[PDB]
Design a protein around this ligand. Sequence first.
Ligand code: GT4
Ligand code: ZN
Ligand code: ZN
Ligand code: ZN
Length: 459
Amino acid sequence: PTHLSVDTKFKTEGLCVDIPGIPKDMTYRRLISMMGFKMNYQVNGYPNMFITREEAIRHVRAWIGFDVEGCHGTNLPLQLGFSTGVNLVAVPTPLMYKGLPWNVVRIKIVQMLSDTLKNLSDRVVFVLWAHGFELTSMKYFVKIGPERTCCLCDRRATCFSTASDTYACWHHSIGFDYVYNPFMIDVQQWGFTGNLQSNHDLYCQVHGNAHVASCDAIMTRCLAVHECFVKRVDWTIEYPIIGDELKINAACRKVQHMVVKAALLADKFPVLHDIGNPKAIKCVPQADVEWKFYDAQPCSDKAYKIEELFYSYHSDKFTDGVCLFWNCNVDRYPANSIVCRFDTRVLSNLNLPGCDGGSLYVNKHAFHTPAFDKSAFVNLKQLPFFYYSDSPCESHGIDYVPLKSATCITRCNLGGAVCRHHANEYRLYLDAYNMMISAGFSLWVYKQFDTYNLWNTFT
Ligand SMILES: COCC(=O)Nc1ccc(O)cc1
Ligand SMILES: [Zn+2]
Ligand SMILES: [Zn+2]
Ligand SMILES: [Zn+2]
């Protein structure tokens, strides 16, 4: 059972207000036919327009909430809402666009999905809370058929042009008018009691209902994200590389080793409490320190309460030494900490919008992270940039412009002039640091941290 069967039953109760007298007994096959699409028995890689929850989770980057609200059904004009915040009005003659015919509306839809998804995914998945109009309106902007490749590249086709009779991916679809072979999933098929707002509002206060179609489209995708990534967590699903994932993860490993090595040299803590990943290894394996591990998985709902991680009866004394919280999101960190906390507000192709202020960070695996809260770090300060190194000054083996910096903490810089080796290593580390910061990670440290205490290790 790879794909969803077209002979699977579809509960049509949520459709009977827009579609009165709809058969209670309904399959995907009959629904697709009712929507105006002919599948003609096609074993060409597109078995069903509707997909399973497991396939939807594998393609979370393609999710676009979609909702259609009648303003007045081929007689009345429809308001099309997308989780991008766009509202288009179609006439059959929170960005609100005036009533325009379908032939020009469909052009805007391909432009919008292409610009939203070209750097995210090879497809679109319309996430629905289906009442009728969104499915019946799909025939005015969707064309289906066999799986195809782009006319200008090797990616799968996601768009079609009537003007040129050709197919394109999101990167080459300029001027295309049809959405080609889209995917869709109805959240209402998952078994919920009550309307969209009542289910969404149970888990989210950040999205409201200004009573437009895009509001519902946003609430739909947020409810889907809550169900598939907040309450249900599967860390065994891998995701393709769509950006700087390899560089960001290597930058995070270098920064961690650096920052923890220097805190241990500067303040010589006798014990380090490493709270987080149950699979974590010592990031500074040569340190003298008593390294103690505490397991806590990444929290996806709310950030951990420090009282429930530390108390209820390890050294038991977390107040001795330093606490390391590398991506272990808590409500309020203790004052003796080193913290890497992902900032959910960051705008990037890896960070997708989430539930209740949180975000879905997709790098190798999907991690719904709770909302970034500035008050979590009141007992700490922002960790300032510095590069520290005790390694010998020796070139071995790119050209050179002499490096002058107050934050290159090395024997050569103490001695008055940074050597070539430490200058290459400084600029490589600064690049990894800027990568890590721009990916959304924020660094914080105990208030007594001072890089001035690092020069004394050059005696
Ligand atoms: C389908 O998954 C393919 C893959 O290898 N993905 C991957 C993503 C990020 C990363 O940092 C390393 C690997
Ligand atoms: Zn292409
Ligand atoms: Zn929400
Ligand atoms: Zn040097």
